[PDB]
């Protein structure tokens, strides 16, 4: 595969072999005072500063030169270009891969096929806005005469995680906004226990869906419909209280919305780059239209960073490298994304899919396998509710995990005096810190010697209060949580997922891989329904299946 | 460390390296159609079956052998009876480990420094069954008069996972219950929306906390102390609304929470496994008393078939063994939970503390360093949704992941005439026939050539269509999600986690790696206060700590 025959990739793999063992950050902090200027990088958008800060990582400024040359060899900034002015390198599927054109409020033209797309993204735009107005003004009324009160987002996947992490995280923007829901899994229990809290008067559905086909949604959308149905017993009152985000103009229709109450994308908007585009009405209904395009902006200037940036200070690429050199030299499977922000509790999942759904790959551009591995597994929770959950294996176990940690300086909720964020902070830097340094033999001792404890009772414990530490941290800081700062976040991963694709030599943007599943569920389905016993497929499919008939009338 | 030494584990391994390759599940599906009934397990619990199908795993009749002689070697069962009779098996804190008793419905006696523990379990459960009575009722009164519609939980970790778990779990069990709601960041996002939307006259704070010292929850509890007294202007009326779950009475009343409102457990309840305990009382106040007795009862009956099960077929034996299998012969780093119910959204991330703090250890009982891995890292999103998240690269990655699929047969919300739940079903069987079963280059051209592409279209998708399968999962599929299946499921994987760490010789009960993080936080706090510089700490902390005083 392109990566093993790379001369870079062995040169790092040769110096990973060699010396490896002058990787012990206590000592490297010791011997360069410097160390966190030389390993960080400050980014002033105009609108917060962003410090990315991976002086805490296993690399000398040898390394990074080694990484860097490895990003210039396997040419990440040709396959920059190549999606920025809209060439269709989503190659398995010969499709433009242009998110970027979303966010692009410089308005300089993006040539598909020799077209502008600028033009339709405006467009659809300018739609949203409108729209937005309307329904948060109480302008769209509802088929009895009610202003809207809750908006339900229906969709999966890319049509799901993004709306809804932003929302989440940017709650405190929503004053004056209806509710929103997010309704994504077929399990009944998702559209049940939410239709029972709406009115039907004031509700407003959002079917989000690309393709417009997808089973989840297009059931749980008729679900919703005959919900509100059995309340309107009028079929033009769907007109008021349905609309749609999809690609799909004909299966829109024959779902029954109307064509003026659909918002289009594209095929080059990957579903999980998808909520810069119409697919983001809900994040725009919620918070506003004018706070939905200070998201795109930070998105907007991180695009440009990445862009116009040197590799060796350029933030999604540093990232990116560091991320490899754990990947293909260490051979971490993982990497945790650690938020010190309740606001960010789905910003983990978020990137579950953007990182495992775009790298999790195995075939590269020639055809051939890879000899190497590819995306990590994606995982985390808030701080500081991990530090109680699993920290104690990050700090104690017998795994190296790679951790983003990331905070806010200024809080949203500045309560106590700012009390609850002090000690917030305080704890985000403690735990890289701890993860650093660790404790030795030699300073537990003296420890348990001043608890006074026996000398017998202090050798049995001691072994356990050692930390070995020399665990690597990535600590990015940012001035606050606003619409524009999480655009600007959010790119930054986006365009680190991209750089990682390129090193590898896979498509970070097609997702064949989800087909399997889709089609033998649709040769299962019809097998469920009797009661006669299933000997079709494998013997544990069909044991499972006859199971489930037998418990099915259970009482 | 005493497992790589142990002559099972090395049998184990040797077999590994000599027969790796002969593990197909493709061909050994096609050679044996007794698969199923050989590798699977059908529990009655008489309030529900379980159908463990360990089935799609890379084992083979030899292999099972070999690791339940492991488990013999390594002395699970001996290991299984001092925790269940009281001996003081977290060793390196001298303590007993008794969750079992929190659920001991027999009330057959378990001694603890000689004396049974079982009447003092009783008797907290006696006042929680009185206490949720008279809140449920409205008995119990606010300092206006008015009827408890909210509680409110505050605590962390331990004293946060479980109850929040399963008050989602078993949500459909809540009606005429109080609204409940989790308080447990120190990020004061979270207990300040939460009082946003909370009436102080009719809102209970229940402040669970197994020591009464942590920082995140005491700070929080003062700061809804200090909004509850601005309102009531009277504090005589706390009374009416706090009360704590805790081991520590000297400072519950230092806090001024009133004795008759603490509700008490033992040092011998483990934070990750204190649901069952006080702890739960947010539980049984949203879905009442009985059904906080059948979620008891459900654990119950998992902790006798732990007990009385011979180890080939005991379920929670099962599973820790398979995980062996993959973490200290394949090398896979994680475990992933997949549960096809959108009630179960957050029993993976409490399982990420029930297995990840307990089994992320690296020193074994006699003190020496382990030369094998322990714990894997635990993660996982409910389905359909983790599909269409993160479902490719389990398919087409570069990683081995084991996975539990795990799903009830009947729904709670059986809408469209089961239509959803027959979907949610035969996408959870399609996903595991999938990942065992590829899709090979020969079927991927066939079905190319089907649809209709031309050569130069088939040759250019075919390689990226091959899935190549051969990834194993356990599925277990239960009759219903009810507060005792529940209890059953929880303790499964409990006993699990217990199984691992006796053959890791690890301590699965103690936590001593969080002890570091604290005391740098506590050095760091007073320095964040000034404006000064900072240079007490290497650069990076000294920087990050600068650039946060720059940005305030």
Same mark, same amino acid.
């Given at each position: 595969?392109?990566?093993?025959?790379? !001369? /870079?990739? /062995?040169?790092? /793999?040769?110096?990973?072999?060699? =010396?490896?063992?002058?990787?012990?950050?206590?000592?490297?902090?010791?011997?360069?005072?410097?160390?966190?200027? =030389?390993?960080?990088?400050?980014?002033?958008?105009?609108?917060?500063?962003?410090?990315?800060?991976?002086?805490?990582?296993?690399?000398?400024?040898?390394?990074?030169?080694?990484?860097?040359?490895?990003?210039?060899?396997?040419?990440?900034?040709?396959?920059?270009?190549?999606?920025?002015?809209?060439?269709?390198?989503?190659?398995?599927?010969?499709?433009?891969?242009?998110?970027?054109?979303?966010?692009?409020? $410089?308005?300089?033209?993006?040539?598909?096929?020799?077209?502008?797309?600028?033009?339709?993204?405006?467009?659809?735009?300018?739609?949203?806005?409108?729209?937005?107005?309307?329904?948060?003004?109480?302008?769209?009324?509802?088929?009895?005469?009610?202003?809207?009160?809750?908006?339900?987002?229906?969709?999966?996947?890319?049509?799901?995680l993004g709306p809804l992490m932003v929302t989440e995280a940017l709650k405190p923007y929503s004053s004056g906004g209806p509710r929103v829901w997010y309704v994504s899994n077929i399990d009944g229990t998702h559209i049940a226990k939410t239709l029972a809290q709406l009115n039907p008067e004031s509700s407003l559905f959002i079917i989000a869906s690309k393709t417009f086909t997808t089973q989840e949604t297009i059931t749980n959308a008729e679900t919703a419909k005959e919900w509100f149905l059995q309340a309107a017993k009028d079929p033009s009152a769907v007109a008021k209280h349905f609309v749609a985000l999809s690609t799909n103009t004909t299966k829109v229709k024959e779902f029954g919305i109307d064509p003026q109450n659909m918002f289009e994308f594209w095929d080059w908007v990957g579903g999980r780059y998808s909520l810069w585009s119409a697919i983001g009405l809900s994040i725009a209904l919620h918070v506003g239209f004018d706070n939905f395009e200070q998201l795109l902006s930070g998105a907007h200037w991180m695009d440009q960073h990445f862009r116009t940036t040197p590799l060796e200070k350029n933030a !999604?690429?540093?990232?990116?490298?560091?991320?490899?050199?754990?990947?293909?030299?260490?051979?971490?499977?993982? =990497?945790?994304?650690? !938020?010190?922000?309740?606001?960010? =509790?789905?910003?983990?999942?978020?990137? /579950?899919?953007?990182?495992?759904? $775009?790298?999790?790959?195995?075939?590269?551009?020639?055809?051939?396998?890879?000899?190497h591995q590819t995306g990590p597994i994606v995982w985390g929770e808030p701080g500081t509710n991990g530090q109680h959950a699993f920290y104690q294996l990050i700090h104690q176990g017998t795994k190296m995990i790679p951790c983003d940690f990331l905070i806010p300086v200024q809080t949203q909720h500045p309560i106590r005096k700012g009390l609850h964020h002090k000690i917030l902070l305080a704890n985000f830097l403690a735990q890289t810190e701890a993860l650093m340094r660790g404790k030795s033999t030699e300073e537990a001792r003296k420890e348990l010697q001043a608890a006074g404890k026996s000398p017998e009772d202090l050798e049995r414990l001691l072994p356990h209060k050692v930390f070995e530490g020399n665990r690597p941290t990535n600590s990015i800081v940012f001035t606050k949580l606003t619409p524009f700062m999480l655009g600007a976040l959010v790119a930054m991963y986006e365009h680190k997922i991209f750089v990682q694709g390129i090193i590898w030599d896979i498509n970070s943007f097609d997702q064949w891989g989800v087909e399997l599943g889709k089609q033998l569920a649709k040769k299962i389905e019809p097998e469920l329904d009797g009661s006669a016993q299933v000997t079709s497929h494998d013997a544990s499919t069909n044991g499972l299946i006859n199971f489930i008939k037998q418990q099915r009338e259970a009482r």
């Open positions: 595969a392109a990566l093993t025959r790379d !001369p /870079q990739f /062995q040169k790092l /793999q040769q110096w990973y072999r060699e =010396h490896r063992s002058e990787l012990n950050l206590r000592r490297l902090f010791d011997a360069n005072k410097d160390r966190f200027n =030389h390993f960080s990088l400050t980014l002033n958008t105009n609108h917060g500063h962003i410090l990315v800060d991976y002086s805490k990582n296993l690399v000398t400024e040898d390394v990074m030169r080694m990484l860097v040359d490895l990003a210039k060899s396997r040419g990440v900034e040709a396959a920059r270009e190549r999606m920025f002015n809209g060439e269709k390198i989503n190659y398995t599927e010969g499709r433009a891969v242009l998110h970027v054109a979303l966010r692009n409020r $410089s308005n300089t033209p993006i040539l598909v096929d020799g077209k502008d797309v600028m033009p339709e993204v405006n467009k659809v735009l300018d739609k949203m806005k409108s729209f937005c107005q309307r329904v948060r003004s109480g302008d769209w009324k509802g088929y009895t005469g009610k202003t809207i009160t809750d908006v339900i987002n229906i969709g999966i996947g890319g049509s799901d !999604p690429v540093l990232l990116a490298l560091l991320g490899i050199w754990y990947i293909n030299c260490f051979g971490c499977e993982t =990497h945790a994304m650690l !938020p010190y922000d309740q606001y960010l =509790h789905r910003f983990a999942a978020y990137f /579950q899919q953007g990182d495992m759904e $775009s790298n999790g790959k195995y075939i590269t551009k020639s055809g051939t396998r890879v000899d």
